[model samples]
Structure formats: structure tokens, C-alpha cells
Target chain A: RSLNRVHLLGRVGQDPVLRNPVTIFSLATNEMWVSQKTTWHRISVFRPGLRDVAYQYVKKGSRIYLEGKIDYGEYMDKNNVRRQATTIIADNIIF
Target chain B: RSLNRVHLLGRVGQDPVLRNPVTIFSLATNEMQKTTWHRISVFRPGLRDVAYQYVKKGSRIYLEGKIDYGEYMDKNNVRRQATTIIADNIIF
Candidate 1:
């Protein structure tokens, strides 16, 4: 058993982009520190109804909370060493 | 004014290190035998100092932190970006 969930409660960085089965959008996340800066995440929706709802409602600068699972697709680099690519899959979207 | 938090419960891949201003380590989740690594940075008032002392390699740790995307250069000078959790709280 494993835990791979990611929670993002932040502002949208840009408009959502829809590419058939997947709708993607960027969210801005910031940490509180004496010296801090905003980080970025791209959330993708694959659920049918949620995918359409995301594209219709998601806009730049919109503040929303999302519940999703993070993914790591495995691959091998040039040296044959292992590599992992992170992906955020959004399943629950809060307006 | 906004909230950005991440909750991770996984096994630590390596022993934690006090890296300058923060404590850094990696947590890997066992998802169907596929290894997924997550980097965590502890910068709380005393969290890092405490973790570096007790947290060991291949230990299970639960950490709550704000998610951050950080950039670094490898030994070969290849630039890379990583998704990391900035720990504000930790539980052994």
C-alpha cells in the first residue's frame, strides 16, 4: 500500500487547456518564509464530467482547492539510470 | 494570505541532512512496486535540527508542509527542476 495524493489550494496561473481526454491548467503555490517565492503545478483532469466542468469554470487567478493523486512515470535516461516524471491528476475540484 | 500545503506519509529513502538553512531528504511511496521519490525540506524553527538527529534512512515519516517547486544543478551541471514539500511539521 502507498500514499500518492497531492493537495493544492492556490490560484490558477493561467487558463485551462483541453486536449481531448485531458484538460490541463497551472496552479500557483507559495510557501511562507522570510524569503519566499511562488511555485507552480500543472493539474490535469481526465474524468469526463470534471474535465468539461474544469474547462468551463477554471480561469486565470481563480482560487480553488483540488484533491488529486500525483503520478511518477518511470523511464530510463541516457545512462540507463532510472528517471521519474511527476504528474498531478485532479479528481475533485472545489470552486 | 493563501494556503499551500502537502501531506506525505511515506518511507524515507535516505538519511536526512541538515542542508544549510533546512533539512533535506527524500520520501518514496510503494505504489505497486513502482518507486516514486519525493523530496522534502524541513525549515521550521526546530524541525530540521530535530529530524537530522533521529530520522534515519528507510524510515517511515509523516510530514505536513507547503509544496514547492525548486531548481538545482546536478554534479554534471545539468539543470533540473523538482517538486518538493517544504515541511512545517513532522511526526516520526
Candidate 2:
């Protein structure tokens, strides 16, 4: 009984950064919410190789639409022990 | 320039039947895609009602989730129409 989902319409904070020589691009999505006023949420995109394409096509301060599901996993950090992390995997993007 | 969205978990195809009395329980969601998976949209909900609440465990169906926007003016009648999200809310 779980539905991990998020839909956002916002701007990319900056060009996606390449984590490695491979293909992953880390993207940041900004969302605005109005609770008494307006609020924002920063959603990170982990689309291994798609970040380059996104950074090329999506520009800073430009409005974009995307939908995806949240994923969580654990990995060993610098400390050696397993560390847990969560990220969104984008399935659809509209610029 | 806009994003009208819908997200449905799936259920009820029987239960939510308040129509005019108060609630609505017409739910159905199950997914079985063999090839390319795409987005599915369905509506007519007065609120973001839970469709799966009435569904039995192990039952398979398709649930539609969407974001609504825009307004249209009907010419036949002097009506102005607008779309909105009705998240599951009970006003008692």
C-alpha cells in the first residue's frame, strides 16, 4: 500500500552537473507551494545519463514540467557503514 | 506552459456512491503494460477521493492520476467552466 510519486512544474536551478565521465546528471527541480503564502521544494533528479540532455535542452530560469516516482536505497558512505539515500527517477519530462 | 495532473491508486468500482447525497465512490485502477508504459488520465471526481479504499486486496486495476487546469466557456448555455483538483476531503 504505497504510492511514491511527485509531479513538479518549476525551473532547473542550474545546468545539471556530471558526477562522472559516464552519463549521470544530477538535476534540481524547484517547486512552489502556497501555505499561507508560497513555499518551495527542491527535488533532485537522478537519471544516470539523461542529465546531459536535460542540461542541454532545459535552461536555467525556464519553466519545465516533469513527473516521476521516488526511490530509496542504501549505500556505504565514507564512514564505511551503509548509508541510506532517496532520490526521484524521472520518467517523463516536458520542456 | 501548464500541467494538469492526475494520480489514482485504484479501487471502489462499487462503494463511493453519494452522487447528490454527499460522496462518490466510483474507483478502478490496475496496470498491466507489456510494452511501453505511458501516462493515463481519468476524471469526474469531485475531490481527490481514494479509489482503492474499496478495492479488495490482490485485485488488479488501473488508477488514473492527473492535475487539472484551464477554463472553457460554453456557448449553448451562459456557463463558465473551470477544472480543479478535489483531493479526498470530507466536510462534516
Candidate 3:
């Protein structure tokens, strides 16, 4: 069974820089566990035409809200090894 | 054991009318199942003063939430109980 969903509200770590024309900046959200330990999860957003606009309009350390489904898959990397990962595909974002 | 999740993207059926300063309007989302094919679920939103200004009829919406479960029993009432999905938050 594959059911993926995630909700996160956090601040942008730094100014979003486009890796490509469509991929926007990545966001990092911090979480605290029961053991007094904290970790950061990186979120990547892919917006086809709003790459530059996001950088110009969205500032660093701003409160942002997002909701979306999670996706996971496995692929053969360049080294001919299988790689598996999960990512969030955003449906709606609020600032 | 309670784990409720829903994802729906649809249009508002009517303008959100405020019932109270915190209670906003309602939304309906249509769904289909192989058994009979058509189902509509009503969604209620609760928010402060911004309710009237935030949502409008025919506006596109996306929601994610859980289904609440419990039972009701009465001699005159129906025996069949139900489960309802109560939203945590809504976005347009």
C-alpha cells in the first residue's frame, strides 16, 4: 500500500536558488524529538515557471505553510546501484 | 486506533456564510466509488473574522484531514452509526 501525505509549516532556510528553470528553492524544517534531539528535513519544490519569481518574492526565514502527498520510488543510479527515496509533491502553499 | 486522511480538490458550492464570528461557510466535495459511483461530502470550516473575506463560492479548494468516529444509540434512533471527516484546516 502506498499512501503519502505531509503537512509542514516552517521558515525558509535561505534564499531559494533555482537549480533549473522549473525547480525552485529547497526548504528546511526543524523538528524536535523526545530525546532532546533535533533534526532538519529538506523539502524541494518544483514549479515549472515560477523559479525566479519565488526567489524574488519569497524571502528567507519567512513563515510558510504547505500540504501535499508523499511519493517514493526506486531507481538505478549512475553507479548501477538501486536508490530509494521519498519526497513531497506540493499541492498548495501559503505564505 | 484513529488515522484519518483525505485529499480533495474541488470548487465551492455556495458562498461561505458566517454562522458566527468563528464558524465559516460549508463546502462540498464529490467522490466516486466502484460500488454505487456517486457520493458527496460536506465540509465545515471554523475561523475568526477573516472567514467572510477568505472563501467565496466557486473558488477552488484543497483540503486534508481525518475521519472522526463514534457511536450513537437510542431506541427511536437508527441503529446504523456513521463516520465523519472533520477538517483541521482548509485552503483556497
Candidate 4:
């Protein structure tokens, strides 16, 4: 009874940052937004195999398609300010 | 420079509410994910009106739209952020 999924087709906003337990990148999509045409989404790869591939191969401005599920969590910054994040867990990353 | 879309298939959390220039509904996408309810806002001319008329609590539907993020002040004087799916097309 639960289905949380997302499909994104766009370019990398910046070069991915490779790290432990997760690899991260931002994807920029162009749309007819009310005040703007670009929205950046946080893409997080958790699978061990895909994480390495994304960090090594994906580059800024590379156009690709991605299939993933949405995840939400909150974290505290260095200043102790809590911030919420919406991320796409890329189970399937395409070229 | 292309494609900023979100496609969701889920049940409406409760009866949709008609708001100024939009219809607001909460979606519970229960496909192995069961943490949060998605806030969906319909803005497209015909589809927006139809959503309010037909969609109700527990109604399963598929919607296509783009994701949006914004912030508002909470009652506690803390700044909070929210994510919404702006509906452009829908299927019952």
C-alpha cells in the first residue's frame, strides 16, 4: 500500500562528492517554475556498487536519467541549526 | 537544461481541500516506503478542479508534476521547510 518513487532527467549541478556510507550529487532540472526554470535535487547513492560509479563517472553538466525513491531526514549543522533534507535514493542510475 | 518532473502513485491521505488558485492533497505513497506523507498541490486549469471534485480519502491515483521546495515560519517562531509536488497531469 506504499509506493514512493521519483524519476529525474537532467544534468549534474556540480561534481559529485564521494564519501563513506553515501555518495552525493545535485541534479539540475529545467522547468516552467513560477519564479524560475531550474530546480536542483539532491541525489544520494547508497548502494556500494552504484556509489562508486556515480562518484567516478558522473561529472558536472552530464545529462542523464535516474530512477529513485524519495527520502526525508533532518540533521544539525555546525551551528546547531537543524535542517531538513529531501533526497532521492538512486536505486537505478542511468547514463 | 531539461525535464524536472515527479510522478507519484499513491492514496490520498484525506479529503482534498480547495484553496486559492489550487487544490491541496496529502499523498501516502506506500510502496515499501512509509515514513512521510507527500504534500501535493494541483495547479493546472482543468486537472486542478477535477482533483478536488474526485479525489478523496483513500483514493488511489497517479499524478505527474514537478517537485518544489519552500520555507515558512512555524508557530514556534522556527523556520521550517516543506516539499510539494505541483500536479500537472493526473490519472484515476
Candidate 5:
């Protein structure tokens, strides 16, 4: 048995970026207590249909409900140092 | 409105490491076409006690939790980052 799922309800940090068949955006979710902590996730949508929906409906500060899988990737920064990044590949989105 | 949730069903890679009130384990969750492994951290007292008693290497489990991302310094003094699930519930 295997599963990899993530659920997040938060606000869009900025307008969705549309690039041909893919759409990308950032979401900010908060963990509240005495002091609040915010986690920002980079989200990508690959399905053309979903990508279109995200492009049309997502915007800065918009509240959204999202579901996706966690993906890990590595890239080189401007300084040429290798870095690892974790991103959520969104499969479902709702406003 | 805000939510941070993760659900995983997988096999334990090894016996959990107990450190006072916390139990840490690695879970191997497959994505059909690919396999992914997650490092799971259990912090609740009741869940930690239960995990210590019954969870072992190769045990299958279903877990739900919140994701946490952090960074630390490695032996080489290089910055290393990690993403882990802080388990809220578990079933065997």
C-alpha cells in the first residue's frame, strides 16, 4: 500500500503564472498559536484543464482549497550552489 | 482559512527511534510509477507510547499529519534542509 497526499487551505501569495500547459502559484498557510507561523508552498498544475482553471481563478490573496502530491527537486542557485526544493504538484483546486 | 494536512499509507523502514517524548520513523510510500520515502515524526504522548510498543521495522501503517520544513547544519557545515510530517494520528 502506498499514498502521498497533501491538503492545504490558504491564500494565494500572488497571481498564477501561466506557461503554455502548466500553471504555477504560491500558497501561504498559517499555523497559529501564541505566535503565528506561515508556510509558503510553490504549487504547480500540469493538467491542461486544471491549468486553465487555475489561471483563470487564482490571484493574489485569493482563498483556495488545494490538494496535491509532494515533489522534491534539486537545482543550482545564482551562486551556483546546489539546493533542494519541495513543491506541491496540484491536482485539485477549489475557490 | 488554513489547513495543513498529509496522509500516508506505507511500510516502516526500521524500528522507531525514541527520544524521550518523540518517536521518529521512516515510511516508504509508493507512487505507483515511482516510489517515495517520507520521514515521519510522532509527537503526541499517547501515539508515541503506542508506536513504541507495536510499531517496528516492516510494519504497515496509515498516518495523517501536518507538514513541517526546516533546515539544519550538516557535519560539513553545509546548510541542509528537510521536510517531515508531524503525525497527528496513526493506525496499524
Candidate 6:
């Protein structure tokens, strides 16, 4: 059926980087067991409506709810090694 | 506030490995432009039952769920980590 989506509720890890056509930020979600573990995700907004809102309202440590699609890619690191990364291309965001 | 979730629409890669308390299966989601592949896991009772009854290799499904990070010892006797999607709901 061709669907690729992601939904996350977490806290913003950094301020968004706003640019033409897209905005990007990091979010952190945590899990608790005997000790606590946290997972961080890179979120990107492409829709203008949500991108503007994220640029205006999103801040570090702000609790947010988001929906998006997952993107996987590779890049060269400073040490000249290739690294794989995953990012969420956001369609919506909520507080 | 604690939250962890994932949503995916993809094809089943294999028949589910059914066990006590949890049933597991792999789903492959593709990104056409770049031809990316995402391997996701599904875990929930009703959803698992639905998968077991109706899903087989190449079955297309839409899933809503959460991310679960776990650790286990590997065959090499080394500890390894894994991330899985625990399904909250499933639709075909």
C-alpha cells in the first residue's frame, strides 16, 4: 500500500534550524526500567504551515507530539568514515 | 511526559514467530525515490492474531505503534542492543 510514517511524543533536544522549504530539530524520548534509557530522533518539517509553527514555537526541552515519515541515508564523517543516519520528515507537530 | 511511538506501512517479510506473551514479525517499508528499506517489528495481541491469521510473506499492512529498545546477549557472548516497534494497532 506504500506507507511510511512515524509518530513520536518527546522533548525537543535543540532549537530548530530553519531554512527555505524545511526546518530541522532533534527530539528525545525516554523509557524507564530499573534505570532509564533515552532515544533521540532528528525531526524535519517540510510543510510550510507546520514549519513556520515549529520555527516559532519549538524550543529545547519543549514537550511535543509529532508525526512524520522516516528517512534513512548515509554521510561521511569527519574521520572520513561513512555513517548511517535516520531522520523523521515531519508532517505535523503538536504541544 | 513519556512517549515513544512509530507508524509504518509495509510488506511482511516473514511469518510471525509466535511465542508466549509476544509474537514477532518483520515488516519491510520502502522509499521509492531512493529505494530505502526500513525493517520494523510488530508486537501486540490483537494485531499479532490478525497478522498470524491473515498475513504472510509480502502482505501489505499499515501499523501504528511505539519504539522498544532492548538488550540481549549475542551468540558471540557479547551484549547487543535492538530497537523494535511494539504495535498499538494494525490495518490491512
Lowest lDDT block of 10, candidate 5 chain B: B74-83
Task: Score each candidate by Cα lDDT.
Answer: 0.71, 0.39, 0.44, 0.73, 0.76, 0.66
Instruction: Give one digit per residue, the lDDT tens place, for model 1 in A1-95.
Output: 55767777778988888884788888876766677667677678887888888889999988888877666445656665543334465565565
| lDDT for position A92 in model 2 | 42
Quote the true-contact fraction of every model.
Answer: 0.53, 0.05, 0.00, 0.60, 0.73, 0.61
- Give the B-chain TM-score of model 3: 0.47
Residue range with the least summed lDDT across 10 consecutive positions in model 1 chain B: B77-86
Highest lDDT against the true fold, candidate: 5
Weakest ten-residue segment in model 6 chain A by summed lDDT? A76-85
Per-residue lDDT tens digits for candidate 6, residues A1-95, read: 46666677888898888765778888888888768878877677777787788888898878888777666545544444332334555555566
Complex DockQ per candidate = 0.45, 0.05, 0.02, 0.45, 0.53, 0.36
Question: Could you give candidate 2's per-residue lDDT for residues B5-36 as a string of tens digits?
Answer: 43445333343333423343433333353221
Better of 2 and 5 by lDDT: 5
Candidate 5 docks with a DockQ of 0.53
Highest TM-score against the true fold, candidate: 5
Better of 1 and 6 by TM-score: 1
Per-residue lDDT tens digits of candidate 5, residues A7-94?
A: 9888889888876477888888898976898987878888777788888888898888878877655565455555444555656556
Better of 4 and 6 by lDDT: 4
Candidate 2 residue spans exceeding 4 A from truth = A1-7, A20-49, A67-70, A73-95, B1-53, B65-92
Off by over 4 Å in 3: A1-3, A32-37, A47-53, A72-86, B1-92
Q: Tens-digit lDDT track for model 1 on B22-71?
A: 88888888765677788777777677788888888988877776555555
The estimated TM-scores of all candidates read 0.77, 0.37, 0.37, 0.79, 0.81, 0.64
What's the TM-score of chain B for every model shown? Answer: 0.76, 0.25, 0.47, 0.78, 0.80, 0.69
| Native-referenced Cα lDDT, model 5 | 0.76
Q: Model 3, range A1-95, lDDT digits (tens) per residue?
A: 12235565556667665554443444444434444322233345565434445556667776666655432233543444332222344543556
Name the candidate, 1 or 6, with the larger lDDT value.
Answer: 1
